[PDB]
Scaffold this active site. Structure first.
Site: not given
Ligand SMILES: O=P(O)(O)OC[C@@H](O)[C@@H](O)c1c[nH]c2ccccc12
Ligand SMILES: Nc1ccccc1C(=O)O
Length: 259
Positions: A53, A55, A115, A164, A185, A215-216
């Site tokens: 991603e 970001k 995204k 999601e 997520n 995710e995440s």
């Molecule tokens: O930086 P991380 O913890 O690897 O997570 C990425 C991604 O899952 C996260 O940016 C995200 C998950 N859902 C979203 C929705 C909008 C924007 C961003 C996101």
């Molecule tokens: N990925 C996101 C989506 C919504 C709000 C916060 C986050 C965050 O990573 O902080």
């Protein structure tokens, strides 16, 4: 309610864009765009797919990376073996933009996931016009009627919805809406807490035909493997990659995880 404040900003930003680029114009641009890539085929390729991603910032992290050249970052991602590139396009809290989506689309051959916080049809045609193959839909953000509509419109343009969820109940809603790909997520978009066990609790409940994405929170191979062991078909990673001095190598490490 971090999510609520984000959606308020998004609705205003979308309306301002629409005032300059009409719904008719964006629908025409979407219709004229070359067809989306087969995201499902990409997700079914052997191995745990890594969705890398782009970001720059987030509510939970603040500023992460300047990313002056998102095309070059995405090229690194593809070079490292990423399956899909995710591009955050929300401006107020993530410092992303549609310009990033264009830059990435022009630079990589792999599918591109937009995204953002999709709340109305305008954004769906917009994503398509700018080259998105996959589009995020967030169950926490959308009443079921709206989710089903957004999912239908996404698929009507040939894109795959990444639907999601954060809870089992949200997963059930996603299935009823017709989700073919469900992302869990680990981060709670309301409170910003990260629970990596979410995926493990939710994933077993899903029909085997549904593609499962975790995710995440992925800090390295161990986290990716933990998700894979719980049934993830792909894992989506942002922070650890965008803050890397060597995104290519960082992606390659995840891509080859467990080898
Ligand atoms: O930086 P991380 O913890 O690897 O997570 C990425 C991604 O899952 C996260 O940016 C995200 C998950 N859902 C979203 C929705 C909008 C924007 C961003 C996101
Ligand atoms: N990925 C996101 C989506 C919504 C709000 C916060 C986050 C965050 O990573 O902080």
């Amino acid at each position: 309610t971090v999510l609520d404040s984000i959606l308020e900003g998004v609705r205003a930003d979308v309306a301002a864009r629409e005032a300059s680029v009409s719904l008719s114009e964006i629908k025409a641009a979407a219709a004229a765009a070359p067809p989306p890539l087969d995201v499902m085929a990409a997700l079914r390729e052997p191995g745990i797919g890594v969705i890398a991603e782009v970001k720059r910032a987030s509510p939970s992290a603040g500023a992460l990376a300047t990313i002056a050249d998102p095309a070059k970052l995405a090229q690194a991602y593809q070079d490292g073996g990423a399956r899909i590139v995710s591009v955050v396009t929300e401006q107020r809290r993530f410092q992303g933009s549609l310009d990033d989506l264009d830059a990435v689309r022009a630079s990589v051959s792999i599918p591109v996931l937009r995204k953002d916080f999709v709340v109305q049809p305008y954004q769906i045609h917009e994503a398509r016009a700018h080259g998105a193959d996959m589009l995020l839909l967030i169950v926490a953000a959308l009443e079921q009627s709206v989710l089903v509509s957004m999912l239908d419109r996404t698929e009507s343009l040939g894109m795959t919805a990444l639907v999601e969820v954060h809870t089992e109940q949200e997963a059930d809603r996603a299935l009823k809406a017709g989700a073919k790909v469900i992302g869990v997520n680990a981060r709670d978009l309301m409170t910003l807490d990260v629970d990596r066990d979410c995926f493990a609790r939710i994933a077993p409940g899903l029909p085997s035909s549904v593609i499962r994405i975790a995710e995440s929170g992925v800090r390295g191979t161990a986290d990716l493997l933990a998700y894979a062991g719980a049934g993830a078909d792909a894992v989506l990673v942002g922070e650890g990659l965008v803050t890397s001095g060597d995104p290519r190598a960082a992606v390659a490490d995840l891509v080859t995880a467990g080898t």
